[PDB]
Design a protein around this ligand. Structure first.
Ligand SMILES: [Cl-]
Ligand SMILES: [Cl-]
Ligand SMILES: [K+]
Ligand SMILES: [Mg+2]
Ligand SMILES: [Mg+2]
Ligand SMILES: [Mg+2]
Ligand SMILES: [Mg+2]
Ligand SMILES: [Mg+2]
Ligand SMILES: [Mg+2]
Ligand SMILES: [Mg+2]
Ligand SMILES: [Mg+2]
Ligand SMILES: [Mg+2]
Ligand SMILES: [Mg+2]
Ligand SMILES: [Mg+2]
Ligand SMILES: [Mg+2]
Ligand SMILES: [Mg+2]
Ligand SMILES: [Mg+2]
Ligand SMILES: [Mg+2]
Ligand SMILES: [Mg+2]
Ligand SMILES: [Mg+2]
Ligand SMILES: [Mg+2]
Ligand SMILES: [Mg+2]
Ligand SMILES: [Mg+2]
Ligand SMILES: [Mg+2]
Ligand SMILES: [Mg+2]
Ligand SMILES: [Mg+2]
Ligand SMILES: [Mg+2]
Ligand SMILES: [Mg+2]
Ligand SMILES: [Mg+2]
Ligand SMILES: [Mg+2]
Ligand SMILES: [Mg+2]
Ligand SMILES: [Mg+2]
Ligand SMILES: [Mg+2]
Ligand SMILES: [Mg+2]
Ligand code: NA
Ligand code: NA
Ligand code: NA
Ligand code: NA
Ligand code: NA
Ligand code: NA
Ligand code: NA
Ligand code: NA
Ligand code: NA
Ligand code: NA
Ligand code: NA
Ligand code: NA
Ligand code: NA
Ligand code: NA
Ligand code: NA
Ligand code: NA
Ligand code: NA
Ligand code: NA
Ligand code: NA
Ligand code: NA
Lengths: 337, 53, 132
RNA sequence: CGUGGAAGUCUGUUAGAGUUGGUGUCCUACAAUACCCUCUCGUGAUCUAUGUGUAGGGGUGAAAGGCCCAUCGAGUCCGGCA
RNA sequence: GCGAAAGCCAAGGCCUGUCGGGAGCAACCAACGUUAGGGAAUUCGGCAAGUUAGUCCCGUACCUUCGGAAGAAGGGAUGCC
RNA sequence: GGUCUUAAGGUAGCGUAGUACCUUGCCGCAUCAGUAGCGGCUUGCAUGAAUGGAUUAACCAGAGCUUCACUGUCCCAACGUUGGGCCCGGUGAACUGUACAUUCCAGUGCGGAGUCUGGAGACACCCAGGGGGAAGCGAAGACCCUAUGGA
RNA sequence: CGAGUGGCUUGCUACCUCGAUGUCGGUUCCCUCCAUCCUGCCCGUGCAGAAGCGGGCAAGGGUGAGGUUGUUCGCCUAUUAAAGGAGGUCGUGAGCUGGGUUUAGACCGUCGUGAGACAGGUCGGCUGCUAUCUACUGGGUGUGUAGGUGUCUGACAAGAACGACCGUAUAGUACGAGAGGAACUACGGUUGGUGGCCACUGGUGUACCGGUUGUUCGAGAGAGCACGUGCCGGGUAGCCACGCCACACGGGGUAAGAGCUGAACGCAUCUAAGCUCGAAACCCACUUGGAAAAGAGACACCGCCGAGGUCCCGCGUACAAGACGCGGUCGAUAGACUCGGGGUGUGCGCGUCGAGGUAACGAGACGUUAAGCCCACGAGCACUAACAGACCAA
């Protein structure tokens, strides 16, 4: 009677096209609770190794025992919040009001932007404060960029720019907090926002695979048995019924696979350090040597080595934070062999 | 731990343990060692093995 | 059921012939079904170490032959992963006949058993000569 | 025990003949019956060249209405015929 | 080597089974190799593929028109110096 | 029924058959499960003696079934190899074409509409793809009926 | 007995097509319906509990694997929360299959004087086409909005991004004479689905290294061929699944339902006005797309004689063309070299040994030798090549 079966692949990650920005763009931010603070950070993917950990989970029978855990090493050097953008609430949603920029700029920010030579920070700031008095001030975010020059393994010097929201106590307090950070030079680090043991949402543009067929792209079956020898091997049965007399976009077809933005939820931050403790012998294949600010993310992270990945405090965590996990061993064994 | 075959130290969070029919146990550090053993070759007779040299 | 404390790649299917690691008089067992399992279209129902499976006796004493009994998978050739990352694999695929209360039907168990099976089936474990 | 070496005998892509499956490749073809693998026979009612005989309600047919020049439950050509 | 067999190579012939250049050369297709664990669950049906294999020694059932069945099956051996 | 039609009234055998409608007949074997297969029974819709019956060693690219072995047939797909495919130079057809044509959902209509009606959607051109629709292309239906047709 | 709804079966009719709308069954892939099999929330019970039976709301998700048969259907087995039914030209042959029906060959039974027949059985018996339009999946080039760089907004659009089960504590407790035997809640795991990733395990790996058969280059050394690796053994990177990671809760509004206050109707009444609650369903949350949203958007800075861009060159985190991303001497982008990190498994030669053999000769063993050979990775390193230079542009 033709057994039931779930359709091939999800319809919630489409259209399956090439991403517009290689730099991910979070479409959601954490809720305003504690003290004011930047709600995200970024780094460059290096590779993977494993670490032996002491079971942190209070509800696990293995609590306190040795445990092997996969880890993706991400170089997370300091970034720079170069501006404070203000949004205003309008009948058509949120719109950017103005921006407060600085003077101290990284030597190579001009590889991407037309750096400001003349700007009035106070006028912009005033406009924002007047907006707040009127009660039309929407959320507050910081224009941020990375320093690829600090990461030898990454060929680029051209910084990656992204906007990150600032959540916190009162709007007045977080406004001040924002301005303070910016005015200095915007220099901030992974430490300032995240603590080892917390859950973060990592966003990233997946590894590109160019054009692929329905079998790989959607998970459809290959032709089976005798059918597989007739002239059709990796093509679906049909593009649809007689009626409707058209091909529905829901049928699994060939196309661009990979190089899409994804936001992987609840990634546990195993450790945030600095140096070469996580580097592998011979070097991370197709990457290089890590010797500086890094972050060890539990499991996998979307994207290839060298790609920019974004961090954000988990917006929907399942478990309570279990801070600073005891790392008994980090493998440095060659990834070649 | 040490590889019951070649003799090198097995990198933690790596390797396979083969349980024999009689209940004996053999920790292997890699496929290379497992495979050489399946060929009926003894580690002492292989010059690259840490049992030999 | 209770957590095994190990990740298993089912190495058996409906129809597989495995060794009966006990002295019940049944030598060979044919897997028929896996307790609590529900697959998907075209997928062969799979069974691995630690699963309670329904079985029929293919080889053994006349009296035991053709009987449909329950059993517990004690050993499997396909690897399994332990918490420390190490993989564990056996020389053969084996199961032990069990009754309604999960007590081994036989008196003695032949060959080694995986420590993970012990957690789930105590009385099966407390009959094991070797536990690896 | 040896000798002998019979057979519409066996194995066999020797040559040569045949054409079972792939319902593969091809299917505006390399080809108006092709290609590849697989497969059958291979001293005999065997295969084959050349010459030669049988002619259309007639041949020829170990018989399938098979074959008689890509034409067959009655060839082909022209005529009867607009 | 049993061989007018395979594979390799002479003599002799040829580069005319007559369009080329570029992309690690994607999807998809034609031929095809290898796939862990399971082992016909696939399918009308093991279709397709796979297994076995040469030679010597041992050994060989039912049935039978006594010819056969039979290379039944099964077991062992096999290089070089 | 304990002869009658029309001469006889089915013997040896075989039998649910490549012949059995009922039918997946009933019992058994085998399998977890067997409209299959084999054995027995058998009143055979409608078996049967050269319209040859039964049976049978050997033989078979003949039909069905079982077992060991084997394995990507399958679970469930992956990677690789060679020739294409894609881009470039040169060569260079065919099929098909009433017209118009960016369509979709419904409706209507000779009751199976890109073109009618109402709405919805719709900036143009171009590349690659697998073929949902054009009741796609290909062939004056080989089924069926009709013709005071043919062979 | 009476009244209906559906259009899944069957029958009827003969409207449509006979200058052909390709069959049954199956398969694969997509959407849908609800008369709901499971799951959620409920009502009744001949509801103690447990397990049920019946009913309501409800289509989010699920509804699987096998033995006979071409079968649809159906019978049967073991699993399961359950293994629901139906529509889409009885969805799906310019997708597949070709077992059945229904060509030409043949057999059997029955019928017929016979040719031959059968709404009987049986063996064999073919699957064409290079896509013009449209449709959709993905990729470009342009124009419109009207100079550039970077960052955003969010009209709308998609999602199942999550479904379900087992176990433990609760508890041998509530309930019950006993037998038996729950729940809220908090935990652990599994299964199906989904997205991504390769440290680990596993596959590949006609890169590479070794062994070895036949033959040819006289031997040796070192090589060619054996189908696109002769075969065998090992296998790096990468790609992968059989491997690993991640995929809520909670709000808001409702249905069935449980109630509050409450009148018509002085009482009563969940309803008529009002209100409190209450579904896996709806909305939000979350993920993805999204300035061509014609109301064609916002912000900051740069620039209009110059901001920026294209070509060019060296390359890939990208890639079928195109596109995309990075580097270009103020440089580590690619190659060479040397290290590091890896694969294989101990090179040629020489020395000693070696069953023997007068000797010649001699398979092979040990040493030199963690040797030799090799690397799709990393580092150091400007040695080589990123030069020269052109163009558009308010
Ligand atoms: Cl298929
Ligand atoms: Cl099952
Ligand atoms: K017709
Ligand atoms: Mg075919
Ligand atoms: Mg590696
Ligand atoms: Mg290793
Ligand atoms: Mg199926
Ligand atoms: Mg002969
Ligand atoms: Mg022969
Ligand atoms: Mg002649
Ligand atoms: Mg005839
Ligand atoms: Mg396999
Ligand atoms: Mg089957
Ligand atoms: Mg099947
Ligand atoms: Mg075959
Ligand atoms: Mg019978
Ligand atoms: Mg007679
Ligand atoms: Mg209109
Ligand atoms: Mg006609
Ligand atoms: Mg006719
Ligand atoms: Mg006539
Ligand atoms: Mg058609
Ligand atoms: Mg209803
Ligand atoms: Mg639905
Ligand atoms: Mg149909
Ligand atoms: Mg259907
Ligand atoms: Mg079609
Ligand atoms: Mg067709
Ligand atoms: Mg076609
Ligand atoms: Mg047929
Ligand atoms: Mg048939
Ligand atoms: Mg037939
Ligand atoms: Mg215009
Ligand atoms: Mg070669
Ligand atoms: Na074909
Ligand atoms: Na084919
Ligand atoms: Na059709
Ligand atoms: Na004699
Ligand atoms: Na042939
Ligand atoms: Na004639
Ligand atoms: Na004439
Ligand atoms: Na008769
Ligand atoms: Na013959
Ligand atoms: Na294969
Ligand atoms: Na089409
Ligand atoms: Na017509
Ligand atoms: Na069909
Ligand atoms: Na539903
Ligand atoms: Na069935
Ligand atoms: Na149709
Ligand atoms: Na069909
Ligand atoms: Na067809
Ligand atoms: Na609700
Ligand atoms: Na615009």
């Amino acid at each position: 009677p033709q057994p039931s079966r779930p359709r091939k692949g999800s319809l919630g990650f489409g259209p399956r096209k090439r991403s517009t920005s290689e730099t991910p763009r979070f479409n959601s931010w954490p809720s305003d609770d504690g003290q004011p603070g930047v709600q995200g950070f970024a780094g460059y993917k290096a590779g993977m190794t494993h670490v032996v950990l002491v079971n942190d989970e209070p509800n696990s029978p293995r609590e306190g025992m040795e445990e092997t855990v996969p880890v993706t090493v991400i170089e997370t050097p300091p970034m720079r919040a170069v501006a404070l953008r203000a949004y205003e609430d309008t009948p058509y949603g949120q719109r950017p009001l103005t921006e407060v920029w600085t003077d101290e700029f990284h030597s190579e920010l001009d590889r991407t932007l037309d750096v400001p030579e003349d700007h009035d920070p106070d006028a912009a700031e005033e406009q924002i404060r007047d907006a707040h008095e009127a009660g039309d001030l929407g959320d507050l975010r910081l224009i941020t960029h990375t320093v690829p020059d600090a990461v030898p393994s990454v060929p680029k010097k051209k910084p990656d720019v992204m906007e990150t929201r600032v959540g916190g106590g009162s709007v007045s307090d977080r406004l001040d907090h924002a301005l303070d950070i910016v005015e200095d030079g915007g220099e901030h680090a992974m430490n300032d926002i995240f603590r080892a043991g917390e859950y973060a949402d990592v966003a990233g543009v997946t590894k590109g695979k160019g054009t692929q067929g329905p079998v790989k792209r959607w998970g459809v079956q290959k032709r089976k048995g005798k059918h597989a020898r007739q002239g059709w091997r990796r093509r679906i049965g049909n593009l649809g019924p007689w009626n409707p007399s058209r091909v529905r976009s829901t049928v699994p077809q060939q196309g661009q696979t990979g190089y899409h933005q994804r936001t992987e939820l609840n990634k546990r931050l195993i450790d945030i350090g600095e140096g070469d403790e996580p580097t592998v012998d011979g070097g991370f294949v197709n990457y290089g040597e890590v010797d500086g600010p890094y972050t060890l993310v539990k499991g996998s992270v979307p994207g290839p080595d060298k790609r920019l990945v974004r961090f954000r405090p988990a917006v929907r965590p399942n478990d309570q934070p279990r801070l600073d996990p005891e790392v008994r061993y980090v493998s440095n064994e060659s990834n070649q062999g | 731990r040490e590889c019951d075959y070649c003799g090198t130290d097995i990198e933690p969070g790596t390797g396979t343990m083969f349980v024999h029919k009689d209940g004996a146990t053999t920790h292997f550090c890699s496929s290379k060692c497992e495979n050489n053993a399946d060929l009926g070759r003894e580690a002492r007779n292989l010059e690259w093995t840490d049992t030999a040299r | 059921m209770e957590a095994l404390g190990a990740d298993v790649t089912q190495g058996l299917e409906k129809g597989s012939l495995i060794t009966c690691a006990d002295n019940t008089g049944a030598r060979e067992l044919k897997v028929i079904s896996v307790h609590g399992y529900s697959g998907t279209k075209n997928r062969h129902p799979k069974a691995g170490l630690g699963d309670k499976i329904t079985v029929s006796v293919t080889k053994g004493t006349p009296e035991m032959r053709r009987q449909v009994l329950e059993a517990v998978v004690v050993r499997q050739r396909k690897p399994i992963r332990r918490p420390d990352g190490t993989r564990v694999k056996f020389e053969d695929n084996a199961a032990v006949i069990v009754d309604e209360n999960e007590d081994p039907r036989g008196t003695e168990l032949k060959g080694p058993i995986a420590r993970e099976v012990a957690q789930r089936f105590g009385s099966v474990a407390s009959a094991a000569t070797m536990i690896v």
